[PDB]
Structures are given as C-alpha cells and as structure tokens.
C-alpha cells in the first residue's frame, strides 16, 4: 500500500482531470487499512457526493516549509552573479483571509539543503528539498 501511496503522488497528469484524488483518499482511509471491506463500501463512506479528506497540522506545516524552500530556490535563480541573498523571513498563510499566519525562516546552506526554523534566533532542523 505504501508503495501505491507514494506512486500515486509521482504520476504527473496535465491537460485533463482524473480521479487520482479518490484513489488516494480511499487507500489512505484507516477503514481500508483495517483489513476487510465490503461491496457497498464506497457509498457507505461517501454519502453526499464526494469530499476529499483534509490535512493534519504537521502535514500543513511541512507543506509550508517546502513552499518556503521552493520560493527561495526559485528567487535565487533570477539574481545576477554573487549579488544574491541567502536568508529571509516569510509569512505563509493559505486562504484568501490569511488563515493561520505562520512565520517561517530559511537559510539555504547548500544547493539542496536549508535550515528552516520558526524565525531568527530559533532552533533549526536542516531538512532537504530536491527540485
């Protein structure tokens, strides 16, 4: 299953819609991983239309961190020669109303390594992003 989970996310499809979200949500459901299912499983678990399951706090935090890293990496490309920055303090907030402003730092110690933290003078984790 884990393999499928991972393999679903690496399938790049552009130009038309698909049902990969439904497959992902069905596989990730703890009912499906319980061990047994039924033939009325789908409509039993999807009474009104279809609604994809949401994200937990840590997943949304990780998405924020990766977004900040990507922003910094693409920003450094446009600068000329060595006149480029290496650290910022960003304020990420999804939604049109800025729901949950989360301050973020970034350091870009190498080509594919950062020092993400809460802000300046905050403990750093040194994750990795390759894009």
């Amino acid at each position: 299953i884990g393999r499928m989970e991972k393999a679903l996310d690496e399938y790049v499809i552009r130009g038309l819609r698909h049902n990969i979200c439904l497959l992902r949500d069905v596989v990730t459901e703890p009912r499906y991983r319980s061990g047994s299912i039924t033939t009325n499983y789908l409509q039993e678990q999807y009474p009104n239309g279809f609604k994809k399951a949401e994200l937990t706090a840590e997943e949304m935090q990780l998405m924020y961190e990766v977004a900040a890293c990507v922003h910094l990496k693409r920003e450094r490309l446009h600068y000329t020669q060595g006149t480029a920055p290496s650290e910022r303090q960003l304020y990420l907030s999804v939604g049109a109303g800025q729901e949950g402003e989360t301050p973020v730092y970034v350091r870009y110690l190498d080509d594919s390594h950062f020092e993400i933290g809460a802000s300046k003078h905050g403990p750093f984790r040194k994750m990795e992003v390759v894009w």
């Binding site: 490309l77 446009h78 600068y79 000329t80 020669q81 006149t83 480029a84």
Partner: protein, 489 residues
C-alpha cells in the same frame, strides 16, 4: 510609529512610499530629493508649504541591477504637477540618459496645479520632450495607480508599456462634466476611462492587475527580461532546462481536418522554457498573441496567430499590436520568433471605412525594417498578402521552416479555380478544386522555389530554434542612412 498614513489606509489604499518599498530590494532605496517647496506666492498659496512637494524620486535596485523611479503622492495637493515637481523628474530622466539605466514611474496625479498658471504647462512640455528624445534609448515603463486626467495622460502614452490597477484607477483626456455640458450624456468616470475600457476597447493599457502587491510582484518579473540600455546586450540567465528535452507532443497538435480549430499555445509552450511566458495585452485582439519568453536562458519575443479566435485572421487592432511589439523588440536587440497561421484579412465595409490599408501596412513596415535575427515557422497555412506580411523569407528573414502538412498558395482553391476557368463546363468544382488543392496547396512548390529552408518534423522545432538562435548571436546588419523613417501613421 505609523503616523499620518492611517487616513490613507482607511480608504483601502496604499501610499507612494509603501509602493516604492515594495518594488525595490529590501534596503537599497536612496531617496534623492526630499526638502523642496513650491515657491508659488499666489491665490493664498504662500502658506501650507510641503517638504517633499508631492513627489518621491530615488534610485533603488532590482535583482541586483540598478533602476530609477518616481512616484506621485495623492495626499499632497492631489498630486498636481508644477514648475518645481517636474524639475526632479527631468533631472532623474537626464541622469538615466547619461547612464544606461531605465525609468519606471507610478502615476497618481489628479491633474495640473492651477495656482501656478502656465508653469504647469512648461513642466508638462519638458517631460514630454524628455520622453520623446529618450524613447528607444532606455526602456520606459509606466503604471497607473489612481486617477490620471487632463493633459498629463500623454506622457504615459509615449512610454513603451502602460499597466493599470483594477479597482481604483482610470485615465482619460476630458472629464465627464464637459461631456455632459456639450453632448448631454451622463457617464461615470469608470464607464468613461476605467481599466476594462482601456484593456478591451481603446488598446492603450498593456495589462491589468488585481492589487498593488501583485502589480509590484509581476513588475519585478517583467523587469527581469529587459536589457539595461540601448547598447547593452540581451540578458542571459542560468537555467537547468536544456535543448535536448523531448517534445514529441507537437506531432499531434494540428488536426487532420482543415476546418477544425486548435490552440496555438499548445505549440508555443513546448518550445520555450517552462513557466516563462509573459503575455502582453491578453484581453485585446485575441486573434494574435504577443509577449516575452526565454529560449535556453535568453529572452526572446513571441508573435503568433491563433485560429481559436476568428480563424486567426489579421485585422486593424492585431496589426497595431504586432507592429508596436516588433518595433520595441527591434529597438533593443531582442530576437523575434513567429508562428504563422493566417487565411487572409478580415473582410467587411467597416474595415475599409476604418482604414485597413493604413493599419495593415504598419506590421509589414515593422517586419521589414527590423534587423534582429528572425525565425519563422509555418504550421498550417499562409495565403495572399498575409504570407508576405508575417515575416516572409524575402524580407531579409534569417531562417524559415514549415511543417509537413503546411499550405502556401496565392488564395483559396475556390477562387483560383474560378479565375482559371471563366465559363468552363458546369460541375467543374469536383474535378478541379480537389486537383488544384492537391497539386499546389502544399509546401512542395514553395520549397521548390526556395522560400522555406527545409520541411521538418514538428518534434525538432526546439532543436532547430536553439541551434539557429545560438548561431545568429552576432549578426550585424545596417539600413541606409536616414534621419528617420516615415512609417504609415
């Protein structure tokens, strides 16, 4: 400390200094002049002097490259110009003429300052002359953040590109009060000169943005494309994308039926680098696309027809749009890449009553006068004078290519069959139109004459374009000596 700007933000609007701070780098703005007064002494203006005098001019720095800018201030006197306001702008433009640096201005003026008399006209004239002289020397970009009325509208017009903000901006020559006075019609300011009107109807505005923040964010991206001056070379940026990336999806873009339509962006996007298109005038004359893009890390100019809208037929508005884009691109040594799909010109009385002859000649003049490297690709068809206009090989074109299902003919098969057989026996349609289209509506004849270099598979377009654009990097061509041309206005 957030003093004196609470009144501004309460109206859901930003300040000039905040806009300047958002545009440039975090700490690289050096305000030039800050303690200047109007010295008017008329109509009870001897009092209420202001330190900044309603203008903010500085130098700044974007992406490590220098810039010059100025911003109007709406709080102070409504942003009106004077004998003294225009002096700062003139000094900035003169300095940016000595050094090869561009100029960007954020217009917010409410009109002229009446209390100065004709001195406002003097300042306007000086700014107009500087814009006229320095156009083609340094790129000029203008953004309109608020009201812009009176005769001040003309200086943004001479500038290369004008952008507009959606909710709280407008521009026109004469106010609606005079329109009501003379004609008797009641029209609001937005109905007269709103951003939508200039985006779709008049064709003056080159774009529209939803917010000031987005305006700055994308203005930086636009600035990343431009060359610094007239004599400086085209910028080249590092990029991980490579010319060996596979593009085989182009083999299927063109439908096998001649009456079905397709989107030209499906051809434009694969050739250029990923996520590197900046469309210019997206909502005006949609049958033609113009903008900037990068090919192997160097900025180029894109001009292509679109059979999605009106069968990709040339027109007045499309001609003006393409002509302006080509002229600007050539003025600053930027390569041009074109994609051709045209059945001809739009037929109609309104067209001749509006002067198609003048307007359609502008694109041809711009294409013929240009001396930058050109690359042309004929995908499906090219008929009549439209084939000549859209950068044909005879107009000193560098390299021309065609796709295996193209067609290059004098006109459609029906008209040729009609003219070639006056009173030939009836039913001549079936056994003559098919034969003529088979024999002469194909790139074989044009290739025999030598009008296309080679017939290529659609999968090799990126390879060919990168090769040619790399080889043509150092072309030196010059026109005969002239004081200047005489373009059909």
């Amino acid at each position: 400390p957030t003093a004196a700007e609470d009144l501004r933000h309460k109206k859901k609007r930003l300040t000039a200094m905040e806009r300047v701070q958002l545009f440039c780098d975090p700490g690289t703005f050096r305000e030039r002049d800050a303690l200047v007064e109007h010295e008017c002494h008329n109509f009870g203006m001897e009092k209420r002097k202001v330190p900044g005098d309603g203008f903010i001019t500085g130098t700044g720095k974007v992406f490590g490259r220098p810039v010059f800018l100025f911003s109007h201030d709406f709080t102070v006197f409504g942003g009106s110009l004077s004998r003294t306001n225009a002096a700062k702008v003139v000094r900035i433009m003169e300095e940016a003429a000595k050094i090869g640096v561009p100029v960007i201005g954020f217009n917010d003026s409410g009109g002229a300052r009446i209390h100065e008399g004709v001195d406002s006209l003097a300042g306007y004239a000086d700014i107009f002359l500087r814009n006229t002289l320095f156009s083609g020397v340094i790129p000029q970009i203008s953004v309109i953040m608020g009201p812009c009325a009176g005769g001040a509208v003309y200086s943004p017009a001479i500038t290369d590109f004008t952008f507009m903000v959606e909710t709280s901006s407008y521009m026109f020559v004469t106010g609606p009060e005079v329109v009501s006075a003379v004609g008797g019609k009641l029209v609001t300011k937005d109905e007269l000169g709103g951003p939508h009107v200039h985006a779709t109807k008049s064709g003056v505005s080159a774009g529209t943005f939803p917010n000031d923040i987005v305006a700055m964010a994308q203005l930086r991206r636009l600035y990343s494309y431009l060359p610094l001056s007239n004599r400086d070379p085209v910028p080249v940026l590092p990029t991980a994308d490579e010319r060996y990336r596979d593009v085989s999806s182009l083999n299927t873009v063109v439908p096998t039926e001649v009456k079905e339509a397709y989107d030209m962006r499906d051809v434009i996007y694969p050739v250029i680098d990923h996520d590197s298109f900046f469309e210019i005038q997206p909502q005006f004359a949609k049958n033609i696309i113009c903008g900037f893009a990068r090919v192997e890390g160097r900025s180029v100019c894109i001009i292509a027809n679109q059979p999605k809208v009106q069968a990709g037929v040339l027109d007045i508005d499309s001609s003006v749009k393409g002509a302006r884009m080509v002229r600007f691109a050539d003025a600053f040594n930027i390569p041009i890449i074109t994609f051709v799909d045209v059945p001809g010109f739009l037929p109609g009385v309104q067209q001749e009553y509006g002067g198609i002859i003048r307007h359609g000649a502008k694109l041809l003049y711009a294409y013929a006068e240009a001396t930058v490297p050109k690359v042309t690709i004929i995908t499906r068809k090219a008929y009549g004078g439209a084939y000549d206009v859209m950068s044909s090989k005879h107009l000193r074109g560098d390299s021309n290519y065609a796709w295996p299902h193209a067609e290059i003919a004098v006109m459609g098969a029906a008209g040729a069959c009609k003219l070639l057989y006056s009173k030939e026996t009836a039913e001549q349609q079936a056994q003559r139109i098919a034969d003529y289209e088979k024999t002469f509506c194909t790139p074989l004849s044009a290739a025999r004459k030598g009008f296309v270099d080679a017939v290529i598979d659609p999968s090799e377009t990126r390879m060919r374009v990168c090769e040619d654009l790399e080889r043509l990097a150092r072309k030196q061509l010059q026109n005969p000596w002239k004081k200047h041309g005489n373009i059909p206005l």
